[PDB]
């Protein structure tokens, strides 16, 4: 029931995050706004688990390490940092970024645990009931794009919560904000593809997601450079579709 999962996830995410967005500007109750955001983030995971509970392969993909293809380890570790530093290099012909290598941007230990927790709470849902529901009705290629769109529009309430990444980028420039929502599209394709190449291993998707977040924190870049990064992501997403195009369009 693909029509039920996403619409139910869409509404639960939207009720909790927009409530947390109201508290985020409240001068009285701002102290608790982050504990309302938590179930909002955890929604796709709990919805997915409930639908499954209401198969052994979900258990398998959760605990079976043998599903993982070790040939994809270099691309799991290295691709995002490579993309980031390439973006800085591509920036240089255009004005600025000489300073950027310095990586001036970026307590240090707990924020890791939070990033790993968010990568977990997201992928348990997306790599659970979510993408399987789409791939059953659709070709892999349009299932991945339908996922990319939903996942992008899933971040939509964050624009309205005080001091969030989505908030600040739109606060600064309309182009910085749109660039983010545009970048979720090829990002949803790359992570998805990586999951299939490792036999739908949810654990690997967690690691990959976590690694994408980590490198985006440690190796910080300006919003102007992130626009270039988005393009690099489209070129990588396009290249991946071409390499596995038979897999992408087969029925």
């Amino acid at each position: 029931n693909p029509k039920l999962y996403f619409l139910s996830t869409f509404v639960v995410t939207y009720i909790l995050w927009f409530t947390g967005a109201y508290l985020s500007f409240s001068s009285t109750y701002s102290g608790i706004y982050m504990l309302i955001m938590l179930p909002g983030l955890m929604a796709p995971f709990i919805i997915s688990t409930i639908l499954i509970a209401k198969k052994k392969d979900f258990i398998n993909r959760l605990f079976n390490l043998k599903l993982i293809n070790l040939k994809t380890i270099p691309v799991v570790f290295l691709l995002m940092p490579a993309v980031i530093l390439l973006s800085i290099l591509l920036s240089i012909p255009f004005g600025g970024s000489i300073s950027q290598f310095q990586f001036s941007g970026g307590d240090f230990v707990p924020v890791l645990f939070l990033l790993l927790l968010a990568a977990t709470f997201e992928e348990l849902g997306w790599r659970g009931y979510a993408f399987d529901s789409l791939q059953s009705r659709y070709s892999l290629f349009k299932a991945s794009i339908l996922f990319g769109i939903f996942w992008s529009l899933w971040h939509f309430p964050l624009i309205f919560v005080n001091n969030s990444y989505q908030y600040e980028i739109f606060n600064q420039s309309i182009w910085y904000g749109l660039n983010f929502f545009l970048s979720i599209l090829p990002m949803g394709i790359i992570i998805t593809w990586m999951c299939l190449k490792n036999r739908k291993s949810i654990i690997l998707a967690i690691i990959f997601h976590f690694l994408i977040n980590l490198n985006q924190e440690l190796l910080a870049i300006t919003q102007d450079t992130k626009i270039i990064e988005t393009g690099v992501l489209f070129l990588v997403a396009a290249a991946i579709i071409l390499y596995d195009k038979k897999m992408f369009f087969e029925k």
Partner: antibody
Amino acid sequence: VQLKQSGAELMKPGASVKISCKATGYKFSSYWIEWVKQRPGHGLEWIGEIFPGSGNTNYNEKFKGKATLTADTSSNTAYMQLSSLTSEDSAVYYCARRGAFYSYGSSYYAMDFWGQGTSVTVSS
Amino acid sequence: IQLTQSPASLSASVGETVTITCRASGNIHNYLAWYQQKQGKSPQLLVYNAKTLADGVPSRFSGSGSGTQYSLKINSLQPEDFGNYYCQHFWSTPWTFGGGTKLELKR
């Protein structure tokens, strides 16, 4: 990184002033420009901010209409215009920058560099 | 959100250690900066995110606090540390500064 502001002004009530703030040493379009008011006995008071390159602005409600922020990216200069001057407008005016925006570990939530200040006096 | 500084005035001698406090009327989630201002000069940044030293700032300065209560500490005051001090929150517009604290030379 340096912010140089224009010189002192002496004005009749009802006139307008345009204060400039020239930026050197960084990319002018990628950082917030702040404007702060300081009178003796009133401490620091925030006026508003502009993001050059996008033209986005966040104003204090009190200075809406009173203060007008603009920015020219070809000359790396931010401007603030004070209209309908009265005695209350007599103060020192600063422009200041915010840090570059990063998701984690940034001086973005700080006024990290300041201009030297522009003294404005308004009297008949 | 209004911010309140105490004390308004603080008398001290070279070598002493002093602490200035800042109170927010609402939770500002560590979005707090501290500035120093000499007479006739512009404010300079000392600390942001409540806890982080700005570039060039001596390590005798330090900031702490959370929620609604924040403070700045100067360990072993130097002659150059005498002047004014302000706190400022960055949680939500409008940004407000504290009334300031004047650190004067004891006599």
